[PDB]
Amino acid sequence: AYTKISDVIVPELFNPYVINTTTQLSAFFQSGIAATDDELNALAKKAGGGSTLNMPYWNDLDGDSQVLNDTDDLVPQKINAGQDKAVLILRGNAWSSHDLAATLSGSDPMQAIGSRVAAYWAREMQKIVFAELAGVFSNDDMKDNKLDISGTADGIYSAETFVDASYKLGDHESLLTAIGMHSATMASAVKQDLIEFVKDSQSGIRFPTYMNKRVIVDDSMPVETLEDGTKVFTSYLFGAGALGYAEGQPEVPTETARNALGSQDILINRKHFVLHPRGVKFTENAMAGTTPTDEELANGANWQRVYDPKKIRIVQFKHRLQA
Amino acid sequence: AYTKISDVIVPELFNPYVINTTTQLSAFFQSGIAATDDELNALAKKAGGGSTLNMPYWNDLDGDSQVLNDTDDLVPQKINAGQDKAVLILRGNAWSSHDLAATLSGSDPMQAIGSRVAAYWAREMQKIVFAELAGVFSNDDMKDNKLDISGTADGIYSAETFVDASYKLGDHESLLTAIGMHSATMASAVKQDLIEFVKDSQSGIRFPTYMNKRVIVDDSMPVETLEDGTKVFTSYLFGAGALGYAEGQPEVPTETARNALGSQDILINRKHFVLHPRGVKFTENAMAGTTPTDEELANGANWQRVYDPKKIRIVQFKHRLQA
Amino acid sequence: VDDSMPVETLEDGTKVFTSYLFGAGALGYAEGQPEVPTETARNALGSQDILINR
């Protein structure tokens, strides 16, 4: 062999580098949470098949608890609805190629292969969360207050419908940071509007900005087809600040093993993580398992929310493109 | 007043004794298991919500044998299906002594007061079990392979219909253990059948028996009324070996406070436990909470089950009383 | 910015809003003080404890 801290397999000095590198290099961030508190590093420790965990709300909400005049004592006290049940998911894989890819990277990938896997799970988190929201939030009648459309024969997504969707939260504002986008939309935008290119975070270069919101480019968007040339796009608007996630940990993070009657070897990772909006609750119906559920089944139907209206915090609008 | 193992509360030496005697005394047992995997304790030890998960599977260690021919290998016995959820419940009540206090208030309660407790406690456990088990079949046909029927005025419950129900465990016979029954039925039995008192320990005493089994006399039963004053008795037959359960523990099982204005001292116990047939997985659907549920709602309706066909294992059969 | 404003409805389409203009500089307030600002107490017959301010 070679140096190969994976093929000489020091599980120490490696795994923390892996996860940290994943956090830093990935984005999001932010947008959503980064390095969530103790609370979730605790409930992330000993657990099991859920449901999930709780996951409090935030505001203690009081301001009733009325005139203390003569005679009550006080009423100790009110709390509102509750739960917010969600999913704990499990993932992992080996590495596709042989030691071919592994040390084809080079000799001593103390930081190389780690960077590799890190970027990989970055993309993972991206896809899972994005498809998750898309699978749930839009389809029900319960969330309707957070969606706008117009989106028949007149509107371009510029400078105005962005205002409406932006203020569909009437109480809260300056809580918009990230913006989800479909490529064609930002094409229309960089045509008409002023979306400019700003090295903004320091250091590093760079990534686009509409207004001082950070924008996030993504490939996957639901795209319909109606008769008469029309195409309707989604492009969620949230940038809530934030969602949340906690790590947990499996056992045996990385295992170096080889084979015999062929020439190969295999690396593996298999990490667990817990991520979801809070936000709506995840019910248990129409799902096999477990755990986790799936990608698809983690989408297709059957979620239920309790707040309701505010402090969700996400919105969507289906807008006609630039015609 | 006394040693007050409750009232000045020595928490050692006690709660373990309460649990131990709690199992030892009341039965069931067996029938059902004792001390299955404590996985649901690693869940009971934090954390979990409703429902419980991950209680598979092992409904046998079978899979015959591995011919072992010449050069060849095996590792067969790879099988799966839907897994399970069930329930996790929490309960408790009080126990009250008085300030004027007709005394004693035991001197050596570490056997005594605990013993009374345990007696009460498991005596409630029976109520839960038989309730839920009576809750399965209520609204469903999916169990219908497991239920014989009669009521055309023929069949006595003895010596025949019991044998047919014996075959109703689909492939497997001679796995039976105990027989659940209503008192009037076994009255007809005693007037006819061979029911034979059987001493257990030598000499220690004793369980009634139908045939080489334990008989369980319980009171609350499904009881119908047709027209014509004639009646229908259900009387489950399982002797499966088994149901299942595991405990976990809260914080602070034992606590002591007294009342000022009133004249009392009060006690509480409150242990958590899991019980359910495996057997159907319990749905969280169209029902209250949360958590745990009820007696009633743990009975009324809306359950769903996955194995299926056999190795469940319970059957009910309905018949007229002797005539 | 504030959430609560009186909002009327005149039939039709009109909506009339309030949105006070003051910024006087100022109003005024003084605290005073009660007795027992914060009291830590618990319960028995259940698992809780309670904090209070008043």
Side-chain angles (χ1 to χ4, degrees), chain A residues 109-128:
Chain A
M110 288 179 181
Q111 295 77 3
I113 54 175
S115 62
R116 304 290 297 279
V117 51
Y120 166 70
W121 288 108
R123 298 179 65 252
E124 295 303 315
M125 294 176 180
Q126 180 62 58
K127 183 177 179 180
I128 181 63

mmCIF file with all atom_site columns, all heavy atoms in Angstrom, chain A residues 109-128:
data_model
loop_
_atom_site.group_PDB
_atom_site.id
_atom_site.type_symbol
_atom_site.label_atom_id
_atom_site.label_alt_id
_atom_site.label_comp_id
_atom_site.label_asym_id
_atom_site.label_entity_id
_atom_site.label_seq_id
_atom_site.pdbx_PDB_ins_code
_atom_site.Cartn_x
_atom_site.Cartn_y
_atom_site.Cartn_z
_atom_site.occupancy
_atom_site.B_iso_or_equiv
_atom_site.pdbx_formal_charge
_atom_site.auth_seq_id
_atom_site.auth_comp_id
_atom_site.auth_asym_id
_atom_site.auth_atom_id
_atom_site.pdbx_PDB_model_num
ATOM 1   N N   . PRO A 1 109 ? -3.498  11.535 1.427  1.00 0.00 ? 109 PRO A N   1
ATOM 2   C CA  . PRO A 1 109 ? -4.708  12.359 1.451  1.00 0.00 ? 109 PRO A CA  1
ATOM 3   C C   . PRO A 1 109 ? -5.244  12.536 2.861  1.00 0.00 ? 109 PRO A C   1
ATOM 4   O O   . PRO A 1 109 ? -6.423  12.288 3.127  1.00 0.00 ? 109 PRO A O   1
ATOM 5   C CB  . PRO A 1 109 ? -5.678  11.553 0.586  1.00 0.00 ? 109 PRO A CB  1
ATOM 6   C CG  . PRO A 1 109 ? -5.291  10.145 0.864  1.00 0.00 ? 109 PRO A CG  1
ATOM 7   C CD  . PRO A 1 109 ? -3.808  10.122 1.156  1.00 0.00 ? 109 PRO A CD  1
ATOM 8   N N   . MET A 1 110 ? -4.369  12.942 3.785  1.00 0.00 ? 110 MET A N   1
ATOM 9   C CA  . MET A 1 110 ? -4.849  13.325 5.105  1.00 0.00 ? 110 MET A CA  1
ATOM 10  C C   . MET A 1 110 ? -5.985  14.324 4.980  1.00 0.00 ? 110 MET A C   1
ATOM 11  O O   . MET A 1 110 ? -7.028  14.177 5.622  1.00 0.00 ? 110 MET A O   1
ATOM 12  C CB  . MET A 1 110 ? -3.719  13.903 5.957  1.00 0.00 ? 110 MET A CB  1
ATOM 13  C CG  . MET A 1 110 ? -2.692  12.895 6.453  1.00 0.00 ? 110 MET A CG  1
ATOM 14  S SD  . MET A 1 110 ? -1.392  13.693 7.421  1.00 0.00 ? 110 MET A SD  1
ATOM 15  C CE  . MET A 1 110 ? -0.353  12.295 7.835  1.00 0.00 ? 110 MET A CE  1
ATOM 16  N N   . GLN A 1 111 ? -5.829  15.322 4.123  1.00 0.00 ? 111 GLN A N   1
ATOM 17  C CA  . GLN A 1 111 ? -6.948  16.212 3.869  1.00 0.00 ? 111 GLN A CA  1
ATOM 18  C C   . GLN A 1 111 ? -7.659  15.991 2.531  1.00 0.00 ? 111 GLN A C   1
ATOM 19  O O   . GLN A 1 111 ? -8.792  16.470 2.373  1.00 0.00 ? 111 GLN A O   1
ATOM 20  C CB  . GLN A 1 111 ? -6.454  17.653 3.991  1.00 0.00 ? 111 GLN A CB  1
ATOM 21  C CG  . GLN A 1 111 ? -6.020  17.970 5.422  1.00 0.00 ? 111 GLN A CG  1
ATOM 22  C CD  . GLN A 1 111 ? -4.662  17.384 5.769  1.00 0.00 ? 111 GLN A CD  1
ATOM 23  O OE1 . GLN A 1 111 ? -4.002  16.785 4.920  1.00 0.00 ? 111 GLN A OE1 1
ATOM 24  N NE2 . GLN A 1 111 ? -4.255  17.523 7.024  1.00 0.00 ? 111 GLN A NE2 1
ATOM 25  N N   . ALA A 1 112 ? -7.099  15.200 1.611  1.00 0.00 ? 112 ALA A N   1
ATOM 26  C CA  . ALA A 1 112 ? -7.709  15.151 0.284  1.00 0.00 ? 112 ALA A CA  1
ATOM 27  C C   . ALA A 1 112 ? -9.000  14.347 0.266  1.00 0.00 ? 112 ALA A C   1
ATOM 28  O O   . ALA A 1 112 ? -10.092 14.904 0.088  1.00 0.00 ? 112 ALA A O   1
ATOM 29  C CB  . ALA A 1 112 ? -6.719  14.583 -0.728 1.00 0.00 ? 112 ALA A CB  1
ATOM 30  N N   . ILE A 1 113 ? -8.888  13.031 0.438  1.00 0.00 ? 113 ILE A N   1
ATOM 31  C CA  . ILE A 1 113 ? -10.069 12.176 0.425  1.00 0.00 ? 113 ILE A CA  1
ATOM 32  C C   . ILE A 1 113 ? -11.129 12.702 1.384  1.00 0.00 ? 113 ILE A C   1
ATOM 33  O O   . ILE A 1 113 ? -12.336 12.613 1.115  1.00 0.00 ? 113 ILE A O   1
ATOM 34  C CB  . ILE A 1 113 ? -9.658  10.732 0.747  1.00 0.00 ? 113 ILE A CB  1
ATOM 35  C CG1 . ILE A 1 113 ? -8.871  10.705 2.048  1.00 0.00 ? 113 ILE A CG1 1
ATOM 36  C CG2 . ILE A 1 113 ? -8.825  10.154 -0.370 1.00 0.00 ? 113 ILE A CG2 1
ATOM 37  C CD1 . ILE A 1 113 ? -8.542  9.330  2.506  1.00 0.00 ? 113 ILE A CD1 1
ATOM 38  N N   . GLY A 1 114 ? -10.698 13.282 2.503  1.00 0.00 ? 114 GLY A N   1
ATOM 39  C CA  . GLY A 1 114 ? -11.650 13.893 3.411  1.00 0.00 ? 114 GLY A CA  1
ATOM 40  C C   . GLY A 1 114 ? -12.443 14.996 2.745  1.00 0.00 ? 114 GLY A C   1
ATOM 41  O O   . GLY A 1 114 ? -13.672 15.021 2.810  1.00 0.00 ? 114 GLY A O   1
ATOM 42  N N   . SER A 1 115 ? -11.746 15.931 2.101  1.00 0.00 ? 115 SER A N   1
ATOM 43  C CA  . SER A 1 115 ? -12.444 16.945 1.323  1.00 0.00 ? 115 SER A CA  1
ATOM 44  C C   . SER A 1 115 ? -13.436 16.297 0.370  1.00 0.00 ? 115 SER A C   1
ATOM 45  O O   . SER A 1 115 ? -14.590 16.734 0.260  1.00 0.00 ? 115 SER A O   1
ATOM 46  C CB  . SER A 1 115 ? -11.433 17.793 0.556  1.00 0.00 ? 115 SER A CB  1
ATOM 47  O OG  . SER A 1 115 ? -10.713 16.992 -0.362 1.00 0.00 ? 115 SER A OG  1
ATOM 48  N N   . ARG A 1 116 ? -13.006 15.231 -0.303 1.00 0.00 ? 116 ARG A N   1
ATOM 49  C CA  . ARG A 1 116 ? -13.868 14.515 -1.232 1.00 0.00 ? 116 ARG A CA  1
ATOM 50  C C   . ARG A 1 116 ? -15.195 14.161 -0.575 1.00 0.00 ? 116 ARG A C   1
ATOM 51  O O   . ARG A 1 116 ? -16.254 14.705 -0.923 1.00 0.00 ? 116 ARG A O   1
ATOM 52  C CB  . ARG A 1 116 ? -13.156 13.251 -1.700 1.00 0.00 ? 116 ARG A CB  1
ATOM 53  C CG  . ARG A 1 116 ? -11.815 13.508 -2.327 1.00 0.00 ? 116 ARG A CG  1
ATOM 54  C CD  . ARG A 1 116 ? -11.964 14.175 -3.655 1.00 0.00 ? 116 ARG A CD  1
ATOM 55  N NE  . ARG A 1 116 ? -12.673 13.306 -4.578 1.00 0.00 ? 116 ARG A NE  1
ATOM 56  C CZ  . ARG A 1 116 ? -12.103 12.315 -5.246 1.00 0.00 ? 116 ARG A CZ  1
ATOM 57  N NH1 . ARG A 1 116 ? -10.811 12.066 -5.096 1.00 0.00 ? 116 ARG A NH1 1
ATOM 58  N NH2 . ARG A 1 116 ? -12.825 11.571 -6.066 1.00 0.00 ? 116 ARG A NH2 1
ATOM 59  N N   . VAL A 1 117 ? -15.134 13.251 0.397  1.00 0.00 ? 117 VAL A N   1
ATOM 60  C CA  . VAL A 1 117 ? -16.351 12.797 1.059  1.00 0.00 ? 117 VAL A CA  1
ATOM 61  C C   . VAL A 1 117 ? -17.153 13.980 1.589  1.00 0.00 ? 117 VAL A C   1
ATOM 62  O O   . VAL A 1 117 ? -18.387 14.006 1.491  1.00 0.00 ? 117 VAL A O   1
ATOM 63  C CB  . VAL A 1 117 ? -16.005 11.783 2.165  1.00 0.00 ? 117 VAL A CB  1
ATOM 64  C CG1 . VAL A 1 117 ? -14.943 12.324 3.068  1.00 0.00 ? 117 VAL A CG1 1
ATOM 65  C CG2 . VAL A 1 117 ? -17.230 11.492 2.982  1.00 0.00 ? 117 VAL A CG2 1
ATOM 66  N N   . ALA A 1 118 ? -16.467 14.993 2.114  1.00 0.00 ? 118 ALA A N   1
ATOM 67  C CA  . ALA A 1 118 ? -17.164 16.151 2.658  1.00 0.00 ? 118 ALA A CA  1
ATOM 68  C C   . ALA A 1 118 ? -18.072 16.775 1.612  1.00 0.00 ? 118 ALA A C   1
ATOM 69  O O   . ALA A 1 118 ? -19.292 16.874 1.800  1.00 0.00 ? 118 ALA A O   1
ATOM 70  C CB  . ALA A 1 118 ? -16.158 17.180 3.167  1.00 0.00 ? 118 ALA A CB  1
ATOM 71  N N   . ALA A 1 119 ? -17.488 17.181 0.486  1.00 0.00 ? 119 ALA A N   1
ATOM 72  C CA  . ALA A 1 119 ? -18.292 17.760 -0.581 1.00 0.00 ? 119 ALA A CA  1
ATOM 73  C C   . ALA A 1 119 ? -19.425 16.829 -0.966 1.00 0.00 ? 119 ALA A C   1
ATOM 74  O O   . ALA A 1 119 ? -20.554 17.272 -1.234 1.00 0.00 ? 119 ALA A O   1
ATOM 75  C CB  . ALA A 1 119 ? -17.411 18.059 -1.788 1.00 0.00 ? 119 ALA A CB  1
ATOM 76  N N   . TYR A 1 120 ? -19.154 15.527 -0.961 1.00 0.00 ? 120 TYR A N   1
ATOM 77  C CA  . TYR A 1 120 ? -20.209 14.579 -1.277 1.00 0.00 ? 120 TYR A CA  1
ATOM 78  C C   . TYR A 1 120 ? -21.414 14.743 -0.358 1.00 0.00 ? 120 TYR A C   1
ATOM 79  O O   . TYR A 1 120 ? -22.545 14.951 -0.822 1.00 0.00 ? 120 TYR A O   1
ATOM 80  C CB  . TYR A 1 120 ? -19.679 13.159 -1.199 1.00 0.00 ? 120 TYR A CB  1
ATOM 81  C CG  . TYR A 1 120 ? -20.798 12.188 -1.193 1.00 0.00 ? 120 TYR A CG  1
ATOM 82  C CD1 . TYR A 1 120 ? -21.556 11.982 -2.325 1.00 0.00 ? 120 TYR A CD1 1
ATOM 83  C CD2 . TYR A 1 120 ? -21.120 11.491 -0.047 1.00 0.00 ? 120 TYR A CD2 1
ATOM 84  C CE1 . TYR A 1 120 ? -22.600 11.124 -2.307 1.00 0.00 ? 120 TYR A CE1 1
ATOM 85  C CE2 . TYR A 1 120 ? -22.152 10.611 -0.035 1.00 0.00 ? 120 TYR A CE2 1
ATOM 86  C CZ  . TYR A 1 120 ? -22.884 10.426 -1.170 1.00 0.00 ? 120 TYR A CZ  1
ATOM 87  O OH  . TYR A 1 120 ? -23.919 9.534  -1.150 1.00 0.00 ? 120 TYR A OH  1
ATOM 88  N N   . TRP A 1 121 ? -21.202 14.647 0.952  1.00 0.00 ? 121 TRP A N   1
ATOM 89  C CA  . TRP A 1 121 ? -22.360 14.739 1.829  1.00 0.00 ? 121 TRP A CA  1
ATOM 90  C C   . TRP A 1 121 ? -22.986 16.121 1.789  1.00 0.00 ? 121 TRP A C   1
ATOM 91  O O   . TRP A 1 121 ? -24.186 16.262 2.050  1.00 0.00 ? 121 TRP A O   1
ATOM 92  C CB  . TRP A 1 121 ? -22.002 14.341 3.256  1.00 0.00 ? 121 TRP A CB  1
ATOM 93  C CG  . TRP A 1 121 ? -21.777 12.885 3.382  1.00 0.00 ? 121 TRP A CG  1
ATOM 94  C CD1 . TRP A 1 121 ? -20.595 12.246 3.567  1.00 0.00 ? 121 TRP A CD1 1
ATOM 95  C CD2 . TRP A 1 121 ? -22.763 11.871 3.239  1.00 0.00 ? 121 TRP A CD2 1
ATOM 96  N NE1 . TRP A 1 121 ? -20.795 10.895 3.611  1.00 0.00 ? 121 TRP A NE1 1
ATOM 97  C CE2 . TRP A 1 121 ? -22.123 10.642 3.399  1.00 0.00 ? 121 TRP A CE2 1
ATOM 98  C CE3 . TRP A 1 121 ? -24.135 11.890 3.012  1.00 0.00 ? 121 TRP A CE3 1
ATOM 99  C CZ2 . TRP A 1 121 ? -22.804 9.442  3.335  1.00 0.00 ? 121 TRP A CZ2 1
ATOM 100 C CZ3 . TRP A 1 121 ? -24.808 10.704 2.944  1.00 0.00 ? 121 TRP A CZ3 1
ATOM 101 C CH2 . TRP A 1 121 ? -24.147 9.495  3.107  1.00 0.00 ? 121 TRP A CH2 1
ATOM 102 N N   . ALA A 1 122 ? -22.207 17.146 1.451  1.00 0.00 ? 122 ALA A N   1
ATOM 103 C CA  . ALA A 1 122 ? -22.805 18.442 1.163  1.00 0.00 ? 122 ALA A CA  1
ATOM 104 C C   . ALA A 1 122 ? -23.942 18.294 0.162  1.00 0.00 ? 122 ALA A C   1
ATOM 105 O O   . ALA A 1 122 ? -25.111 18.574 0.473  1.00 0.00 ? 122 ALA A O   1
ATOM 106 C CB  . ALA A 1 122 ? -21.747 19.403 0.633  1.00 0.00 ? 122 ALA A CB  1
ATOM 107 N N   . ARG A 1 123 ? -23.613 17.836 -1.047 1.00 0.00 ? 123 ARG A N   1
ATOM 108 C CA  . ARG A 1 123 ? -24.647 17.642 -2.058 1.00 0.00 ? 123 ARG A CA  1
ATOM 109 C C   . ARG A 1 123 ? -25.799 16.806 -1.522 1.00 0.00 ? 123 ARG A C   1
ATOM 110 O O   . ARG A 1 123 ? -26.974 17.110 -1.774 1.00 0.00 ? 123 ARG A O   1
ATOM 111 C CB  . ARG A 1 123 ? -24.048 16.984 -3.295 1.00 0.00 ? 123 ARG A CB  1
ATOM 112 C CG  . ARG A 1 123 ? -22.983 17.812 -3.972 1.00 0.00 ? 123 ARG A CG  1
ATOM 113 C CD  . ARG A 1 123 ? -22.435 17.079 -5.171 1.00 0.00 ? 123 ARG A CD  1
ATOM 114 N NE  . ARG A 1 123 ? -23.455 16.900 -6.199 1.00 0.00 ? 123 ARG A NE  1
ATOM 115 C CZ  . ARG A 1 123 ? -24.026 15.736 -6.484 1.00 0.00 ? 123 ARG A CZ  1
ATOM 116 N NH1 . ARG A 1 123 ? -23.681 14.652 -5.810 1.00 0.00 ? 123 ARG A NH1 1
ATOM 117 N NH2 . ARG A 1 123 ? -24.941 15.655 -7.435 1.00 0.00 ? 123 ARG A NH2 1
ATOM 118 N N   . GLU A 1 124 ? -25.479 15.756 -0.768 1.00 0.00 ? 124 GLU A N   1
ATOM 119 C CA  . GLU A 1 124 ? -26.528 14.940 -0.165 1.00 0.00 ? 124 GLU A CA  1
ATOM 120 C C   . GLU A 1 124 ? -27.531 15.798 0.591  1.00 0.00 ? 124 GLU A C   1
ATOM 121 O O   . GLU A 1 124 ? -28.714 15.868 0.220  1.00 0.00 ? 124 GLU A O   1
ATOM 122 C CB  . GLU A 1 124 ? -25.899 13.904 0.756  1.00 0.00 ? 124 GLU A CB  1
ATOM 123 C CG  . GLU A 1 124 ? -25.060 12.934 -0.011 1.00 0.00 ? 124 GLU A CG  1
ATOM 124 C CD  . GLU A 1 124 ? -25.875 12.247 -1.070 1.00 0.00 ? 124 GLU A CD  1
ATOM 125 O OE1 . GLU A 1 124 ? -27.010 11.819 -0.763 1.00 0.00 ? 124 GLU A OE1 1
ATOM 126 O OE2 . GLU A 1 124 ? -25.402 12.182 -2.220 1.00 0.00 ? 124 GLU A OE2 1
ATOM 127 N N   . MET A 1 125 ? -27.062 16.469 1.645  1.00 0.00 ? 125 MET A N   1
ATOM 128 C CA  . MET A 1 125 ? -27.933 17.319 2.446  1.00 0.00 ? 125 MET A CA  1
ATOM 129 C C   . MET A 1 125 ? -28.766 18.216 1.553  1.00 0.00 ? 125 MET A C   1
ATOM 130 O O   . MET A 1 125 ? -29.991 18.325 1.722  1.00 0.00 ? 125 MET A O   1
ATOM 131 C CB  . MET A 1 125 ? -27.094 18.152 3.411  1.00 0.00 ? 125 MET A CB  1
ATOM 132 C CG  . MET A 1 125 ? -26.391 17.334 4.462  1.00 0.00 ? 125 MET A CG  1
ATOM 133 S SD  . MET A 1 125 ? -25.333 18.333 5.511  1.00 0.00 ? 125 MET A SD  1
ATOM 134 C CE  . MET A 1 125 ? -24.675 17.074 6.602  1.00 0.00 ? 125 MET A CE  1
ATOM 135 N N   . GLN A 1 126 ? -28.119 18.824 0.557  1.00 0.00 ? 126 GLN A N   1
ATOM 136 C CA  . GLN A 1 126 ? -28.845 19.673 -0.379 1.00 0.00 ? 126 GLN A CA  1
ATOM 137 C C   . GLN A 1 126 ? -30.067 18.958 -0.931 1.00 0.00 ? 126 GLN A C   1
ATOM 138 O O   . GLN A 1 126 ? -31.207 19.419 -0.766 1.00 0.00 ? 126 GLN A O   1
ATOM 139 C CB  . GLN A 1 126 ? -27.918 20.100 -1.515 1.00 0.00 ? 126 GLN A CB  1
ATOM 140 C CG  . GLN A 1 126 ? -28.580 20.977 -2.543 1.00 0.00 ? 126 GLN A CG  1
ATOM 141 C CD  . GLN A 1 126 ? -29.065 22.268 -1.956 1.00 0.00 ? 126 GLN A CD  1
ATOM 142 O OE1 . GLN A 1 126 ? -28.290 23.029 -1.386 1.00 0.00 ? 126 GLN A OE1 1
ATOM 143 N NE2 . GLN A 1 126 ? -30.360 22.526 -2.086 1.00 0.00 ? 126 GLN A NE2 1
ATOM 144 N N   . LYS A 1 127 ? -29.854 17.796 -1.544 1.00 0.00 ? 127 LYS A N   1
ATOM 145 C CA  . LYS A 1 127 ? -30.963 17.150 -2.230 1.00 0.00 ? 127 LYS A CA  1
ATOM 146 C C   . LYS A 1 127 ? -32.050 16.735 -1.250 1.00 0.00 ? 127 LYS A C   1
ATOM 147 O O   . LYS A 1 127 ? -33.242 16.970 -1.493 1.00 0.00 ? 127 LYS A O   1
ATOM 148 C CB  . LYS A 1 127 ? -30.481 15.944 -3.023 1.00 0.00 ? 127 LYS A CB  1
ATOM 149 C CG  . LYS A 1 127 ? -31.609 15.317 -3.799 1.00 0.00 ? 127 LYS A CG  1
ATOM 150 C CD  . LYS A 1 127 ? -31.142 14.167 -4.645 1.00 0.00 ? 127 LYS A CD  1
ATOM 151 C CE  . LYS A 1 127 ? -32.310 13.553 -5.388 1.00 0.00 ? 127 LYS A CE  1
ATOM 152 N NZ  . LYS A 1 127 ? -31.876 12.411 -6.231 1.00 0.00 ? 127 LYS A NZ  1
ATOM 153 N N   . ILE A 1 128 ? -31.658 16.133 -0.127 1.00 0.00 ? 128 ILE A N   1
ATOM 154 C CA  . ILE A 1 128 ? -32.659 15.588 0.780  1.00 0.00 ? 128 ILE A CA  1
ATOM 155 C C   . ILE A 1 128 ? -33.563 16.691 1.313  1.00 0.00 ? 128 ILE A C   1
ATOM 156 O O   . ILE A 1 128 ? -34.796 16.574 1.269  1.00 0.00 ? 128 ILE A O   1
ATOM 157 C CB  . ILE A 1 128 ? -31.996 14.776 1.909  1.00 0.00 ? 128 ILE A CB  1
ATOM 158 C CG1 . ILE A 1 128 ? -33.065 14.191 2.823  1.00 0.00 ? 128 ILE A CG1 1
ATOM 159 C CG2 . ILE A 1 128 ? -31.012 15.595 2.688  1.00 0.00 ? 128 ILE A CG2 1
ATOM 160 C CD1 . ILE A 1 128 ? -33.968 13.222 2.132  1.00 0.00 ? 128 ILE A CD1 1
#
